[PDB]
Amino acid sequence: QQLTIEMIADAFSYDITGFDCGEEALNTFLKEHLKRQHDGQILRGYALVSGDTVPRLLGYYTLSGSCFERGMLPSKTQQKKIPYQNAPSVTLGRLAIDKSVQGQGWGEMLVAHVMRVVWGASKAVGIYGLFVEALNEKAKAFFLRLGFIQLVDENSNLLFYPTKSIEQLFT
Amino acid sequence: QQLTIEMIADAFSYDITGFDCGEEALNTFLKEHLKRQHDGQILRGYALVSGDTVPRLLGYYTLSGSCFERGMLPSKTQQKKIPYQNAPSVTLGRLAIDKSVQGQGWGEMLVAHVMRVVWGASKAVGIYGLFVEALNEKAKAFFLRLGFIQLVDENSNLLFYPTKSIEQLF
Ligand SMILES: CC(=O)SCCNC(=O)CCNC(=O)[C@H](O)C(C)(C)COP(=O)(O)OP(=O)(O)OC[C@H]1O[C@@H](n2cnc3c(N)ncnc32)[C@H](O)[C@@H]1OP(=O)(O)O
Numbered sequence: 566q567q568l569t570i571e572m573i574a575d576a577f578s579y580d581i582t583g584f585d586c587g588e589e590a591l592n593t594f595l596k597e598h599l600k601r602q603h604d605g606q607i608l609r610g611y612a613l614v615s616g617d618t619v620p621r622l623l624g625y626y627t628l629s630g631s632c633f634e635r636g637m638l639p640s641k642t643q644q645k646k647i648p649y650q651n652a653p654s655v656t657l658g659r660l661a662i663d664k665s666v667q668g669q670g671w672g673e674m675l676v677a678h679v680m681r682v683v684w685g686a687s688k689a690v691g692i693y694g695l696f697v698e699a700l701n702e703k704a705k706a707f708f709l710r711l712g713f714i715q716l717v718d719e720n721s722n723l724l725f726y727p728t729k730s731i732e733q734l735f736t
Numbered sequence: 737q738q739l740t741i742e743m744i745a746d747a748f749s750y751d752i753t754g755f756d757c758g759e760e761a762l763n764t765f766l767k768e769h770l771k772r773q774h775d776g777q778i779l780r781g782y783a784l785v786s787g788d789t790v791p792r793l794l795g796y797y798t799l800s801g802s803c804f805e806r807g808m809l810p811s812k813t814q815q816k817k818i819p820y821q822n823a824p825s826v827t828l829g830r831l832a833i834d835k836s837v838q839g840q841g842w843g844e845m846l847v848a849h850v851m852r853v854v855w856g857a858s859k860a861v862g863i864y865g866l867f868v869e870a871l872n873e874k875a876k877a878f879f880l881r882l883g884f885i886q887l888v889d890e891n892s893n894l895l896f897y898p899t900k901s902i903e904q905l906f
């Protein structure tokens with residue numbers, strides 16, 4: 566499957582009929598809100614797409630600028646380096662892969678693409694890392710295996726991947 | 737141009753000894769904290785610099801990713817377009833010009849550069865506009881005069897410039 570990742574095109578001429586990641590909220594979001602919030606500067610959207618005449622959308626993700634409370638950091642050493650109430654961040658608002666193509670590493674590949682975008686962004690604007698709220702335990706284990714660190718307590722869904730680690734990816 | 741704007745270089749070999757914008761907190765921050773928070777990915781810093789062998793720094797600013805309460809926006813209609821409690825933003829943490837070159841448009845020129853950077857950033861990551869807390873009434877009038885919007889109430893120092901306005905500039 567020769568799939569490619571792109572920012573969602575202005576025309577949004579994707580074939581999304583039948584898209585189902587197995588979580589209805591993210592299926593509905595793709596259909597109703599992705600493009601409008603992208604054009605409204607609430608998020609920016611990226612799509613994993615096929616090479617058909619009308620490219621089919623097989624996955625997508627969204628990024629928004631954010632910040633989060635310094636106290637959520639597990640390392641009190643890192644906390645002492647943040648001289649303000651909040652640490653700056655980018656939030657992975659949503660990530661979803663279509664059922665037809667799950668379990669092959671496409672989810673992993675989208676996260677790698679996220680990392681490169683956030684890395685580029687971190688050079689121009691202060692971004693201490695990538696923040697994500699795991700939607701459920703299945704998603705949480707997914708992010709933990711990719712190396713995300715746990716914020717707050719051991720049963721919180723708030724995870725974080727530091728820019729310091731992102732830059733190590735692209736040396 | 738006589739002075740040029742750049743992201744602060746990794747070596748930070750700028751001559752900052754004589755810098756004085758007239759607010760001691762912003763002078764002290766330049767000297768003690770700017771470069772280390774830039775390297776710490778807390779902010780990214782940009783400087784207005786001369787062309788001497790050791791470049792002299794005549795101004796600087798910092799940008800950090802952020803978000804802010806949707807309720808801050810004055811227009812209840814605009815609030816309905818933001819489907820969450822917080823709107824994504826970039827914060828202008830600091831902006832300062834050395835007194836020797838204040839009143840010549842350099843502050844305005846730095847803000848324009850800010851907007852250009854924020855505009856580029858908004859293409860890749862969702863950013864609803866540029867957030868700033870004015871340090872004092874003098875700074876507040878400066879940003880209002882460049883077209884920033886008053887958030888909360890007429891007596892708050894929280895101001896905002898929407899990406900929608902930035903796009904019209906560019
Ligand atoms: C903010 C949020 O919470 S986003 C929430 C995430 N999204 C959702 O919950 C919606 C529904 N879920 C999904 O869309 C998907 O399940 C996702 C995005 C969470 C995971 O996407 P997937 O493509 O299934 O993940 P990915 O295939 O990268 O996971 C690795 C698995 O693929 C297998 N795999 C096969 N080939 C490869 C490869 N080349 N590289 C890596 N992994 C591979 C591994 O065996 C591994 O299996 P295991 O995890 O069962 O041990």
Ligand SMILES: CC(=O)SCCNC(=O)CCNC(=O)[C@H](O)C(C)(C)COP(=O)(O)OP(=O)(O)OC[C@H]1O[C@@H](n2cnc3c(N)ncnc32)[C@H](O)[C@@H]1OP(=O)(O)O
Binds near residue numbers: 845868878
């Ligand atoms: C988050 C923060 O950093 S807010 C803190 C702001 N920084 C400071 O207070 C530090 C000390 N001050 C400074 O460094 C500078 O005085 C600044 C940044 C506030 C202003 O920069 P300057 O270079 O002096 O301003 P510049 O000459 O570019 O002014 C451009 C325009 O703004 C206007 N302006 C500037 N200050 C004011 C003011 N206090 N009231 C009204 N208008 C003003 C000017 O009149 C000019 O408009 P015009 O061209 O139509 O006449």
